Ligand binder design. Structure first.
Ligand code: 5HG
Length: 496
């Protein structure tokens, strides 16, 4: 197929149009994944005084600020009984006009609900990677993308107009399911329509576009602070994506695999018509297609079954869980640092750009494993130190969270490369999917861990730090891949 894709033009005039269009949605993946930092921000809440009759009606904490979850039973002038606040809460409207937290009183006893919603969105992301991955192999990378643009648009719009919390969570799970399928199918449709030598470039562009999405969330959230308006704005473009996605060309590779070379030929000729190498497309017929593509024409149980591939599976699963679990833990707590939540989102997104370069340098220059111990251990040390250092120190805490997020971004880049290199060709793609699945399990478990803040304010961070420190110790077991050719059989893994 690669000989044929190259026959039909060289990365020119279709691949440029379609890849631009298929990677444009990814800009708003960051906006959706981390949308709750802005759509669910917690304004300062203090209890509403009884209407019958704040200094007299609000108990004060050590800080001298009014206590969030309690109000005095009787008016205290100048040990007073404290009742939970039946009459609701008054929320500061200086920074956040409305958030899901203000709208549904997800405060005090129901504070965990704010994180349950993030976990549910991510349960949707895990489910969608699986459902839409199967559906794409059955119905096409394109048809599944068209339906996913419509689902994200409809679910996200309906979430913005959700009348109650259960409904917002349902439409956020479905938003995530669709978005998981968009992220997968954008990779498959672009990679399969692009030459093998350029495959790495496609993958990197997809990563950088997600990072630029972070700056998009910061700029958009500043402009549209209200949550219903911000959720609608971030889900509206997907309708426009759905409208132009009808003109995408289905992967000829998927057509060949299905058995329908008639559609492989039709796609290859259409692309020739676009790339401008028409003559060369006319030459392409079915006697030419059957020839050469002829040569082109294992189960996850294997990863567990073989002891050699089970060791590589377990170790890498710990590495993918840890990086995601910690990364989401840090990225989903922008308010505590003491700087604006918009500046911190911008800084975090601008740390990805030098992190990815430093990581590339260390990966190639030193090794692929030394980079993973360093990226994960340093992130763990930084997150644990962001737990120990007092809150008053905003600059020390911000700088250490920033460095830590950069290190976990490098770990994501290094684990994507290190994994492919570690697995044999037979179970390589299954292994990269299982690793990504464990990453999604990390993002489901992370908000649940954050709910332990009630037990101890620093327990969420101490766990967000200890898990990457343990994963760094696991990397020691994995085998170095720098300068070694990719394995083709289990025997090769074994020889290593
Ligand atoms: N579901 C996900 N699986 C793996 N990695 C993910 C997932 N969602 C977001 N990411 C991170 C994206 O790549 C790492 P980057 O933030 O440096 O681009």
């Amino acid at each position: 197929f690669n000989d044929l894709l190259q026959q039909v033009g060289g990365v020119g005039r279709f691949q440029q149009i379609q890849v631009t269009l298929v990677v444009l949605p990814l800009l708003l993946m960051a906006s959706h994944n981390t949308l709750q930092n802005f759509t669910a921000a917690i304004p300062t809440h203090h209890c509403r005084p009884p209407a019958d009759a704040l200094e007299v009606w609000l108990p004060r904490d050590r800080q001298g600020q009014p206590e969030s979850c309690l109000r005095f039973t009787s008016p205290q002038w100048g040990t007073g009984a404290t009742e939970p606040c039946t009459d609701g809460w008054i929320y500061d409207n200086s920074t956040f006009p409305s958030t899901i937290v203000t709208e549904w009183d997800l405060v005090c006893s129901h504070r965990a609900l704010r994180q349950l919603a993030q976990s549910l969105y991510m349960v949707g992301v895990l489910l969608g990677a699986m459902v839409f991955g199967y559906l794409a192999d059955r119905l096409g990378r394109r048809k599944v993308l068209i339906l996913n643009y419509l689902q994200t648009a409809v679910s996200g719009t309906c979430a913005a107009f959700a009348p109650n919390f259960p409904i917002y969570c349902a439409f956020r799970l479905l938003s995530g399911m669709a978005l998981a399928g968009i992220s997968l199918n954008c990779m498959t449709l672009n990679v399969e329509w692009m030459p093998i030598h350029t495959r790495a470039c496609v993958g990197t562009l997809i990563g950088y576009v997600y990072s630029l999405g972070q700056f998009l969330l910061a700029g958009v959230a500043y402009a549209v602070p209200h949550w219903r308006h911000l959720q609608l704005l971030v889900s509206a473009p997907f309708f426009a994506f759905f409208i132009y996605s009808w003109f995408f060309i289905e992967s000829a590779r998927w057509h060949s695999s299905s058995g329908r070379l008639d559609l492989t030929l039709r796609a290859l000729q259409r692309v020739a018509r676009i790339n401008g190498k028409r003559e060369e497309g006319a030459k392409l017929s079915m006697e030419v297609l059957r020839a050469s593509l002829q040569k082109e024409l294992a189960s996850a149980m294997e990863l567990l079954r073989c002891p050699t591939l089970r060791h590589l599976f377990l170790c890498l699963s710990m590495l993918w869980f840890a990086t995601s679990f910690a990364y989401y833990g840090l990225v989903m707590d922008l308010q505590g640092f003491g700087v604006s939540i918009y500046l911190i989102q911008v800084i975090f997104g601008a740390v990805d750009l030098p992190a990815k370069l430093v990581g590339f340098l260390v990966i190639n220059s030193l090794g692929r494993r030394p980079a993973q111990m360093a990226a994960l251990l340093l992130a763990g040390i930084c997150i644990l130190l962001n737990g120990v250092i007092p809150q008053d120190q905003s600059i020390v805490r911000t700088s250490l969270a920033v460095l830590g997020k950069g290190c976990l971004a490098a770990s994501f880049n290094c684990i994507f490369l290190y994994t492919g290199e570690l697995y044999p060709t037979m179970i390589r793609q299954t292994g990269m999917g299982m690793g990504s699945t464990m990453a999604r399990v990390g993002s489901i478990v992370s908000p649940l861990v954050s709910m332990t803040a009630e037990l101890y304010p620093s327990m969420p961070l101490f766990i967000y730090g200890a898990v990457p420190v343990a994963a760094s110790a696991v990397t020691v077991l994995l085998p170095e891949t720098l300068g070694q050719p990719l394995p083709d059989t289990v025997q090769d893994l074994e020889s290593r």
